[PDB]
């Protein structure tokens, strides 16, 4: 049965979620919310840049440069080394 639950993957996904929250907690208050709404880590449904700009009161280009700075901050080796093993 190939559509079954592999037991050593469902543990690894849980530890990946915990490590993801542990890495995202070292960021600031707004950039972590921008990432969690841009990729849908809290609700499951992703958002657009206008959807985050509606809740933060700015345009799409202000949200986009915040995201483009946060993704550069996450490519730091202190933030990339503990996540590189999961891919």
């Amino acid at each position: 049965d190939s559509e079954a639950v592999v037991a050593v993957d469902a543990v690894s996904f849980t530890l990946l979620q915990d490590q993801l929250q542990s890495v995202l907690d070292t960021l600031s208050e707004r950039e972590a919310g921008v990432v969690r709404l841009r990729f849908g880590l809290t609700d499951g449904q992703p958002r657009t840049l206008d959807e985050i700009g509606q809740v933060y009161g700015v345009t799409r280009e202000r949200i986009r440069q915040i995201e483009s700075k946060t993704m550069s901050k996450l490519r730091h080796p202190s933030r990339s080394q503990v996540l590189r093993d999961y891919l």
């Binding site: 049965d1 559509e3 996904f13």
Partner: protein
């Protein structure tokens, strides 16, 4: 060799939840033999008049909309297959013929 197989489908890994879920409204349909069925629906959804219920037979909504009989016909109901190949004058001059055979055979 091993021969893996799959019933076609997927297994997703969202951890389950039970508090925030988009809101739903309940319709109620009524079938022909007086049964009541409750169907949930999304709020942004046009609730239809007729629903194929759990009983196996169609049930309309509890309101009085009366949407459509949709003018559906019989199909061929023999006759039609008789009337399409044989005309009325050939039948009327035959049936009466047969009718007279009821008159002559009864008394000899």
């Amino acid at each position: 060799r091993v021969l893996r197989g799959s019933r076609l489908g997927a297994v997703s890994y969202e951890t389950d939840r039970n508090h925030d879920l988009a809101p739903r409204q309940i319709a109620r349909y009524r079938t022909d033999n007086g049964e009541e069925f409750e169907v949930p629906f999304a709020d942004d959804a046009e609730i239809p008049g007729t629903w194929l219920c759990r009983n196996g037979m169609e049930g309309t909504l509890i309101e009085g909309d009366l949407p459509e009989p949709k003018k559906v016909k019989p199909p061929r109901t023999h006759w039609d297959m008789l009337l399409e190949r044989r005309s009325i004058e050939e039948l009327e001059e035959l049936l009466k013929e047969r009718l007279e055979l009821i008159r002559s055979r009864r008394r000899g």
